[PDB]
């Protein structure tokens, strides 16, 4: 059987680079579009990650730094975006599948903060 729970399609150190790679962007742009699935993967990781930032103390700042190697972005998340989702019960990030693409026939989608 295969009753686990996670997605891959690359090795291990990659499915880690990606999720960090997209993690930043979304945080740096608020919205990025991407293959539908990769969004779906992306979602929960950024959220947890946003929830990390939602503490303000060095520690939390430094845990995030682990998954955000661009100083700026981390500060953005740390000081601009994280302080805002305070009031809400963690859970902001939505997806709006768009329409199939052309060169590969893959359905894209939008993941916006």
């Amino acid at each position: 059987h295969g009753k686990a729970g996670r997605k891959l399609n690359r090795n291990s150190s990659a499915r880690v680079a990606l999720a960090r790679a997209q993690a930043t962007a979304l945080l740096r742009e608020g919205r990025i579009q991407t293959t539908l699935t990769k969004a779906k993967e992306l979602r929960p990781f950024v959220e947890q990650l946003i929830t990390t930032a939602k503490g303000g103390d060095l520690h939390s700042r430094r845990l995030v730094a682990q998954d955000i190697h661009d100083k700026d972005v981390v500060r953005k998340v740390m000081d601009e975006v994280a302080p805002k989702y305070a009031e809400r019960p963690g859970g902001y990030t939505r997806i709006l599948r768009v329409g199939t693409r052309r060169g590969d026939g893959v359905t894209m989608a939008l993941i916006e903060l």
Binding site: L96, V98, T107, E112
Partner: protein, 58 residues
């Protein structure tokens, strides 16, 4: 060489007996609520850019 190989040409008939299942399924287009143009249920209307509000730029 090419080890397994076919024992005869297949009838233009049989070769069709097969294909009776490659028939595409026409999308289920739905009519946008605003642009009234047809969209793909659950996705953004490629024409107006809406999905209750307007997401995608024009």
């Amino acid at each position: 060489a090419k080890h397994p190989v076919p024992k005869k040409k297949t009838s233009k008939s049989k070769r069709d007996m097969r294909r009776s299942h490659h028939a595409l399924t026409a999308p289920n287009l739905t009519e946008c609520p605003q642009c009234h143009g047809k969209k793909l249920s659950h996705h953004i209307c490629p024409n107006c850019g809406y999905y209750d509000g307007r997401q995608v730029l024009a």
